[PDB]
């Protein structure tokens, strides 16, 4: 389309370019391939459950019990690390399976489909860091 | 087939059962769905390279430098563990990619297709433990 617009302007046919073609370019740029971008939203407590089952499965303690700065500390070291965090061998409640599966589906779809991941009931930086970490470790 | 054999014997038709039907059952049991079972064979040194790039990527040292008992020790703790070992983020030489990809292909195929994994140039238990660990961590 931009090739058409460029070419048309080249030959002094800009008025033709600024008709149906400009309207089309503007609609492409505004709506893209999806019309809209889906945001995802979930409670912070639902991410806390997932990390708590992870830390329980690794015999490190309960991610729920940790202070906000201990949580911050562990989350930081893990984002700095190079080792994956969990595998299929992981006790998953139905809810935890929902959270991880949502992350996998996000991972399976093109980026132009998604806007923002929104943490309901956010209160502390560890609530954001949890979500970034889950996003990385769900590929 | 066994239902046919059972039924035929029920009615005193065992002589009929012990003809073409018995030959067929025996061929099924002997050749199975693959005729043969593929063995896989690889050098021990080629597994050592893979674990050395893994330990280098995790800033733990060089798996090659470790004594046979230090190797044994690390391999044991990892098999005892519950955390996966590596992800896509891993510097892979062409050879290391071949070894991991062979393990993935093995993981993608039915068990009746495979006999044994054979370590050329085996010398010490850490050569076997390496292969068991790679088999588990390649799913």
Q: Are B84 and A84 in contact (CB under 8 A)?
A: yes
Interchain proximity B139–A58, CB inside 8 Å: no
Distance from CA of B57 to the nearest CA of A (A): 7
Distance from CA of A81 to the nearest CA of B (A): 8
Give contacts of A57 with chain B, Cβ < 8 Å.
82
Q: How far is CA A47 from CA A93, A99, B99, in A?
A: 12, 8, 36
Q: Which two tokens stand for residue A111?
A: 């980026």
Phi-psi region of B90 (alpha: psi -120 to 50; beta: other; left: phi over 0): beta
User: Which residue matches tokens 């989350």?
Assistant: A75
Give contacts of B82 with chain A, Cβ < 8 Å.
57-59, 89
Interchain proximity B82–A58, CB inside 8 Å: yes
- Roughly what angle, to the nearest 10 degrees, separates helices B22-31 and B2-10? 150
Interchain proximity A85–B86, CB inside 8 Å: no
Of B58, B82, B88, the CB nearest to A83: B58
| Header resolution in angstroms | 3.1
Terminal alpha carbon distance of chain A: 34
Kindly identify which residue of chain A lies nearest to residue B81, measuring between CA atoms.
Answer: A58
Q: Are A138 and A104 in contact (CB under 8 A)?
A: yes
Residue B63's nearest CA partner among B130, B128, B124, B125 is B130
Long-range pairs of B74-83 with CB within 8 A, sequence gap ≥ 24: B75/B126, B75/B129, B75/B130, B75/B133, B76/B129, B78/B133, B79/B129, B79/B132, B79/B133, B79/B136, B81/A58, B82/A57, B82/A58, B82/A59, B82/A89, B83/A58, B83/A83, B83/A84, B83/A85, B83/A86, B83/A87
Q: Are A88 and B139 in contact (CB under 8 A)?
A: yes
């Amino acid at each position: 389309l931009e090739l058409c617009y460029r070419s048309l302007c080249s030959c002094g046919d800009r008025p033709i370019a600024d008709g149906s073609l400009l309207d089309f370019l503007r609609q492409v740029s505004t709506f893209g391939l999806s019309l809209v971008r889906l945001d995802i939203r979930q409670e912070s407590d639902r991410h806390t459950d997932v990390l708590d089952a992870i830390t329980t499965h690794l015999d490190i303690g309960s991610y729920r019990e940790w202070s906000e700065e201990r949580r911050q500390e562990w989350l930081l070291s893990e984002l700095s690390g190079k080792r994956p965090l969990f595998g299929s061998d992981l006790p998953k409640t139905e809810e935890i399976a929902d959270v991880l599966d949502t992350f996998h589906v996000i991972a399976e779809l093109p980026a132009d489909s998604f806007g923002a991941y929104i943490i309901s009931m956010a209160t502390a930086p560890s609530d954001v860091l949890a979500v970034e970490l889950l996003q990385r470790e769900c590929r």
